[PDB]
Design a protein around this motif. Structure first.
Motif, PDB file in Angstrom:
ATOM      1  N   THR B  12       0.871  -1.168   0.000  1.00  0.00           N
ATOM      2  CA  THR B  12       0.000   0.000   0.000  1.00  0.00           C
ATOM      3  C   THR B  12       0.914   1.225   0.000  1.00  0.00           C
ATOM      4  O   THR B  12       2.124   1.109  -0.214  1.00  0.00           O
ATOM      5  CB  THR B  12      -0.969  -0.077   1.194  1.00  0.00           C
ATOM      6  N   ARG B  13       0.349   2.407   0.228  1.00  0.00           N
ATOM      7  CA  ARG B  13       1.145   3.621   0.309  1.00  0.00           C
ATOM      8  C   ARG B  13       0.544   4.559   1.343  1.00  0.00           C
ATOM      9  O   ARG B  13      -0.632   4.456   1.700  1.00  0.00           O
ATOM     10  CB  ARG B  13       1.242   4.331  -1.044  1.00  0.00           C
ATOM     11  N   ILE B  14       1.374   5.480   1.819  1.00  0.00           N
ATOM     12  CA  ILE B  14       0.978   6.484   2.797  1.00  0.00           C
ATOM     13  C   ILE B  14       1.188   7.856   2.175  1.00  0.00           C
ATOM     14  O   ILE B  14       2.267   8.142   1.644  1.00  0.00           O
ATOM     15  CB  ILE B  14       1.775   6.347   4.106  1.00  0.00           C
ATOM     16  N   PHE B  15       0.160   8.696   2.237  1.00  0.00           N
ATOM     17  CA  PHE B  15       0.221  10.037   1.673  1.00  0.00           C
ATOM     18  C   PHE B  15       0.677  11.028   2.735  1.00  0.00           C
ATOM     19  O   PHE B  15       0.165  11.023   3.859  1.00  0.00           O
ATOM     20  CB  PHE B  15      -1.140  10.455   1.119  1.00  0.00           C
ATOM     21  N   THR B  16       1.635  11.874   2.377  1.00  0.00           N
ATOM     22  CA  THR B  16       2.097  12.926   3.265  1.00  0.00           C
ATOM     23  C   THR B  16       1.314  14.212   3.016  1.00  0.00           C
ATOM     24  O   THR B  16       0.519  14.318   2.079  1.00  0.00           O
ATOM     25  CB  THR B  16       3.596  13.163   3.082  1.00  0.00           C
ATOM     26  N   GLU B  17       1.547  15.205   3.879  1.00  0.00           N
ATOM     27  CA  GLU B  17       0.804  16.458   3.775  1.00  0.00           C
ATOM     28  C   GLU B  17       1.156  17.225   2.506  1.00  0.00           C
ATOM     29  O   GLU B  17       0.305  17.935   1.961  1.00  0.00           O
ATOM     30  CB  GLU B  17       1.054  17.327   5.009  1.00  0.00           C
ATOM     31  N   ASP B  18       2.390  17.097   2.021  1.00  0.00           N
ATOM     32  CA  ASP B  18       2.814  17.819   0.828  1.00  0.00           C
ATOM     33  C   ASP B  18       2.415  17.116  -0.463  1.00  0.00           C
ATOM     34  O   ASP B  18       2.660  17.661  -1.544  1.00  0.00           O
ATOM     35  CB  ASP B  18       4.330  18.036   0.854  1.00  0.00           C
ATOM     36  N   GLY B  19       1.814  15.933  -0.379  1.00  0.00           N
ATOM     37  CA  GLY B  19       1.363  15.233  -1.563  1.00  0.00           C
ATOM     38  C   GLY B  19       2.437  14.393  -2.222  1.00  0.00           C
ATOM     39  O   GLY B  19       2.710  14.544  -3.416  1.00  0.00           O
ATOM     40  N   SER B  21       3.684  10.299  -2.640  1.00  0.00           N
ATOM     41  CA  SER B  21       3.270   8.911  -2.485  1.00  0.00           C
ATOM     42  C   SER B  21       4.477   8.059  -2.113  1.00  0.00           C
ATOM     43  O   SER B  21       5.453   7.992  -2.866  1.00  0.00           O
ATOM     44  CB  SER B  21       2.624   8.393  -3.769  1.00  0.00           C
TER      45      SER B  21
ATOM     46  N   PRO C  72       5.473  12.683  -8.622  1.00  0.00           N
ATOM     47  CA  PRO C  72       5.820  12.109  -7.314  1.00  0.00           C
ATOM     48  C   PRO C  72       4.646  11.489  -6.572  1.00  0.00           C
ATOM     49  O   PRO C  72       4.838  10.996  -5.455  1.00  0.00           O
ATOM     50  CB  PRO C  72       6.381  13.314  -6.542  1.00  0.00           C
TER      51      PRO C  72
ATOM     52  N   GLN E  10      -7.320   6.229   5.768  1.00  0.00           N
ATOM     53  CA  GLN E  10      -6.681   7.250   4.951  1.00  0.00           C
ATOM     54  C   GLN E  10      -7.502   7.610   3.721  1.00  0.00           C
ATOM     55  O   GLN E  10      -7.292   8.681   3.140  1.00  0.00           O
ATOM     56  CB  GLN E  10      -5.288   6.774   4.529  1.00  0.00           C
ATOM     57  N   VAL E  78      -2.948  15.800  -3.042  1.00  0.00           N
ATOM     58  CA  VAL E  78      -2.587  16.735  -4.105  1.00  0.00           C
ATOM     59  C   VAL E  78      -3.831  17.411  -4.668  1.00  0.00           C
ATOM     60  O   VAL E  78      -3.853  18.631  -4.871  1.00  0.00           O
ATOM     61  CB  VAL E  78      -1.788  16.010  -5.203  1.00  0.00           C
TER      62      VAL E  78
END
Lengths: 120, 209, 122, 102, 113, 98, 56
Positions: B12-19, B21, C72, E10, E78
């Motif tokens: 899976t992946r985790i999204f950070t606040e700055d966008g 992946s 990204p 999430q 995003v």
RNA sequence: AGUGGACGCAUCACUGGUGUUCGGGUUGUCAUGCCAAUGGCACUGCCCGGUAGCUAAAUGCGGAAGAGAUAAGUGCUGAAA
RNA sequence: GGCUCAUCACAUCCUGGGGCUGAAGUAGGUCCCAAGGGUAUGGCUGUUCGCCAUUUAAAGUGGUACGCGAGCUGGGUUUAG
RNA sequence: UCCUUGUCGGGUAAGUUCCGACCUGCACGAAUGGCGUAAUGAUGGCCAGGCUGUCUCCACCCGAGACUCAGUGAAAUUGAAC
RNA sequence: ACAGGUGGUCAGGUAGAGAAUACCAAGGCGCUUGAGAGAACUCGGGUGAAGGAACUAGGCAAAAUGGUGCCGUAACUUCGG
């Protein structure tokens, strides 16, 4: 490379396999007992039981879908009439496999795959 | 430093606040309970043997049952150890959870990669094949030459030939950990790990600087 | 994903219409050109009144690739037709005066802000 | 930090003979930069030298430049201050490109 | 199952539903300078791939005579706001056929309900 | 070169030998062209030739190259001369002096 | 890919060392009839699980 | 301190390929009594997509740092003298 | 001769170290040590070789019966026209 | 046509092939026919547009072999072989 | 009891210009070894991101156009093409 793949091909193409299973299910329903090789019986449960589950609900749309398979009016008529009510209280497992040794012609393992009760 | 043994769940992946992946790999680690401790006096090397998970009572053999009964712990799905780092002391029966990976920031994941069966030269050592036309007959994906002429008269050891790819115990190094949470017994690590879903994995702190 | 002898479009008013990249830069056995690269092109189709003539070989910067470049956040910028912008030989300054069509934002990392300063679309 | 930076740019650009200074507002037309500053240098070495001054002053202002283009060619040189982009370049090439219409 | 517990924690729960083939307005955050601004983006969606937190949809336009194709992820930070401008009416989940024939002769109709 | 100002490195090594063109080989393997040896000179030099002692070129702009020694011409092997009049092609032509 | 010499008696015989048949050694007696059958296989007369299966 | 090119290892989470076992559009014909609705054949009849698996063009990592004795070489003390 | 597969030696193309330097720094020239790794794609001709264009830090030199047709190619040499 | 990859121009960025000009005809030459010739050619060579797994770079899928089991059952070669 | 060759006669419907082609009528057959496993590799095919001959001696093979009616069709020419 077959990792997590299901469904054998039995050294036959899709058309022959579909045509065989078209007749494979019909021979089971008509006689309530059918004797074929072990690998053939395994894929038989993959097709005959879904037809039986379609026969649990008697409707014009479902019968046409059931008639689309086995391409035989006798089989679809036999379903939705007694095959439904008999198994209406049962969830799955509408047939069982009994191995019956090996053939004297090619040493293939046959198996008696039949209904649970066969009402005989 | 001591590692852990876990199970692969998926990717899976985790999204950070700055966008951004970050593809993560979910590693499910149960309470790693120590079943044996080895030292210089008894074995000549400092390492402690640990088990993970649970096994059905009937499937547990009597020799394995007695070994687990000596440690006072229940059955486990497997048996592993981790070499000690000269100064860490542990006691039989001590249960180790994922809190030990909260500061590593870099982990090494070891597991048996998926077996690809008896693979060809093209698939195994990334051989690129010959021409499929221009008169070529009965030889497209074949390796071709396997060496010199009469004067060696033999094929050298370790020649790149046809064989299985995968189904070997392999280690991938310097994997960045993302999130540790003992309340769900999960280890989120960036990257791809060897082995399929549900395969037992050996995770240790990264040896590379 | 652009390799040798691939014909691209034009994204400037130099005069060329159908350019073909002829050699990819970057090192030994360079596989393919990405979205921001220093590519070398040759002129096959150009207007007779343009400042550039047919057959001249020179450098260029790829501006649009229709496979897409990875954002990204696992996103690609798909297009319709690969294009370049002309460049000088001794210097890396573009020859064209205008830029036609929208340009991806990943070109900023390549420090090619001649194209980015122009082309108000994206 | 909207109005402060260009005033921090206009004052320094005029200290080294930055002639014909225009304050533009490209808010809405372009979605890459907030505003751009256009100016003219007398000579190529003048453009090259003034490029160092703005970068050195920017590096002493805390903010880090995002990119430079001046390399073995002083006809067109630009530096990045984040939101604000300045264009130090020759008069001769300025007529070739657009002015006050971008 | 244990992976599924992390799935919705999430995943976004405020994404509007749009029929494949609609004209959608999407705002995308971009990181540059010091702050984050919004990029105004308009197009027609040609393909939707709604699977988990990684649900994706492909949007396409015609810009300056150039067809530009774009892919997003519905549950990513995003993207900021997605809105539907004009509702289309097509009976194909995927609309990759828009590439060949021109957009002018391939104007979509109103779903009209 | 604008990096050099003197000619100290010319009295120490005075003879510069341009590499001879590689000879022909069997299987029609043509020889390799002699590599171009370049003499780096500080900007601002004059050239005078023994005999015709005049100035052929003035070194004023850095980074521009001048040709002061024309190379030779490759010879021709028997394959270049193979014939049916001789019935035995074994003649060869030497390379012209530089 | 043709021989050069005559292989000896052993090389032929030692090759068959792994082709020997293996006895089933899995004779099972039905709890109803008491006749031998394989594991998970019906009897010769057609009894399995000890129940009155078709027996044809 | 960052970012690339080739190479190897691993993975399908992302972008895609395949996916003749899933759904749909359609041409000719035959059949199910007929309308409707279905099935067979015509390369999977021809095409549009696409689950799982596999895969790269897709994305994660490695080329170490360090230790011991050294080549050429640079040294210290140091008699033969 | 080409495709595929490579192996070994250093008389080392680069990377690595040093001496002299006729070594201001960058950029060099020569010699020594060092084979761990890598060492290009195209137009022409069958090309080995070679010319040219365009890259890289590099497009190294040799042996391996000038490797490798019970691996492929038959373009050259090529019986019978 | 030994000098012929002759010299120059066109084609490609790059053309020992090809097309057109210059004659130094070793060994062109007029029914062992000379020069052009529309059309024709499973004829030799070259170039352009579309097209594509020919290739960069292969991956997947469908069938027959290959693999295991049952039945039948070959050959080139062989002085003997640890 | 062989993927080869062998002369004549009768010649249905649908779509088609048709004795080609696809289905079917009467009729004849499933071709005298099969059951599974779904590996390398070979053969016959299907599809493919980006490039479109960059592979090769050579577009070899593959890929591609392919019908009807209308408009229109160059150089050359023996006036027919």
């Amino acid at each position: 490379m077959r990792h997590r793949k299901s469904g054998r091909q039995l050294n036959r193409n899709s058309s022959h396999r579909q045509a065989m299973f078209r007749n494979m299910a019909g021979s089971l329903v008509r006689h309530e007992i059918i004797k074929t090789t072990l690998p053939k019986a395994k894929e038989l449960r993959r097709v005959v039981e879904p037809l039986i589950t379609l026969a649990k609900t008697d409707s014009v749309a479902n019968r046409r879908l059931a008639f689309a398979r086995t391409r035989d009016n006798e089989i679809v008529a036999k379903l939705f009439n007694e095959l439904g009510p008999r198994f209406a209280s049962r969830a799955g497992g509408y047939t069982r496999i009994l191995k019956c040794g090996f053939r004297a012609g090619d040493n293939a393992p046959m198996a008696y795959i039949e209904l649970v009760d066969r009402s005989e | 430093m001591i590692g852990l043994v876990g199970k692969k769940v998926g990717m899976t992946r985790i999204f950070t606040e700055d966008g951004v992946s970050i593809p993560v790999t979910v590693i499910e680690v149960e309470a790693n309970r120590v079943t044996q401790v080895k030292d210089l006096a008894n074995d000549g090397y400092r390492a402690i043997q640990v088990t993970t998970g649970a096994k059905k009572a009937n499937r547990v053999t009597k020799p394995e049952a007695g070994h687990f009964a000596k440690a006072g712990v229940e059955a486990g799905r497997g048996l592993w150890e981790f070499r000690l780092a000269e100064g860490e002391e542990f006691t039989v029966g001590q249960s180790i959870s994922v809190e030990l990976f909260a500061d590593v920031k870099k982990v090494d994941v070891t597991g048996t990669s998926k077996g690809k069966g008896f693979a060809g030269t093209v698939k195994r050592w990334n051989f690129r094949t010959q021409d499929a036309t221009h008169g070529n007959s009965l030889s497209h994906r074949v390796p071709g030459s396997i060496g010199q002429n009469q004067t060696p008269g033999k094929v050298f050891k370790g020649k790149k030939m046809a064989g299985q790819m995968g189904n070997e115990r392999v280690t991938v190094q310097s994997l960045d950990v993302v999130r540790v949470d003992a309340e769900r017994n999960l280890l989120l690590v960036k990257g791809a790990v060897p082995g399929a879903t549900g395969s037992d994995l050996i995770v240790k702190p990264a040896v590379k600087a | 994903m652009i390799q040798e002898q691939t014909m691209l479009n034009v994204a400037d008013n130099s005069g060329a219409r159908r350019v073909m990249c002829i050699k990819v830069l970057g090192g030994s056995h360079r596989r393919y050109a990405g979205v921001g690269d220093i590519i070398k092109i040759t002129i096959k189709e150009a207007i007779p009144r343009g400042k550039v003539k047919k057959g001249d070989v020179l450098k260029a910067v790829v501006v649009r690739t229709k496979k897409g470049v990875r954002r990204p956040d696992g996103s690609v910028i798909r297009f319709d037709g690969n294009a370049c912008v002309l460049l000088n030989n001794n210097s890396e300054q573009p020859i064209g005066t205008r830029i036609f069509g929208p340009v991806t934002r990943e070109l900023r990392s390549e420090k090619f802000m001649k194209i980015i300063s122009l082309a108000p679309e994206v | 930090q909207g109005k402060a930076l260009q005033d921090f740019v206009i004052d320094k650009i005029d200290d080294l003979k930055g002639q014909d200074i225009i304050a533009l507002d490209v808010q809405g037309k372009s979605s890459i930069t907030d505003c751009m500053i256009i100016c003219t240098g007398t000579s190529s070495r003048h453009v090259m030298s003034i490029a160092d001054h703005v970068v050195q002053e920017s590096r002493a202002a805390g903010l880090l430049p995002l990119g430079v283009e001046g390399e073995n060619s002083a006809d067109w040189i630009v530096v990045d201050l984040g939101d604000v982009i300045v264009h130090v370049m020759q008069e001769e090439s300025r007529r070739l490109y657009e002015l006050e219409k971008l | 199952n244990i992976i599924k517990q992390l799935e919705q924690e999430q995943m976004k729960q405020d994404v509007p539903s749009f029929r494949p083939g609609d004209t959608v307005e999407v705002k995308v955050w971009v990181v540059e300078g010091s702050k984050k601004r919004l990029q105004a983006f308009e197009g027609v969606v040609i393909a939707i791939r709604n699977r988990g937190l990684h649900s994706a949809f492909t949007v396409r336009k015609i810009s300056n005579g150039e067809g530009v194709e774009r892919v997003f992820q519905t549950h990513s930070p995003v993207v900021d706001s997605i809105s539907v401008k004009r509702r289309g009416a097509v009976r194909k989940a995927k609309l990759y056929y828009l590439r060949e024939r021109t957009g002018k002769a391939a104007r979509i109709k109103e779903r009209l309900n | 070169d604008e990096n050099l100002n003197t000619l100290i490195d010319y009295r120490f090594e005075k003879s510069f030998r341009a590499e001879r063109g590689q000879n022909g080989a069997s299987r029609d393997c043509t020889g390799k062209r002699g590599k171009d040896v370049t003499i780096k000179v500080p900007v601002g030099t004059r050239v005078i030739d023994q005999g015709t002692g005049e100035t052929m070129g003035d070194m004023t702009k850095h980074g521009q190259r001048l040709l002061v020694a024309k190379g030779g011409w490759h010879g021709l092997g028997n394959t270049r001369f193979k014939s049916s009049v001789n019935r035995t092609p074994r003649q060869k032509t030497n390379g012209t002096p530089g | 890919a043709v021989q050069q010499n005559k292989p000896t008696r052993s090389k032929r015989g030692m090759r068959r060392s792994h082709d020997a048949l293996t006895a089933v050694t899995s004779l099972s007696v039905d709890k109803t009839s008491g006749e031998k059958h394989l594991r998970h296989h019906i009897t010769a007369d057609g009894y399995y699980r000890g129940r009155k299966v078709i027996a044809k």
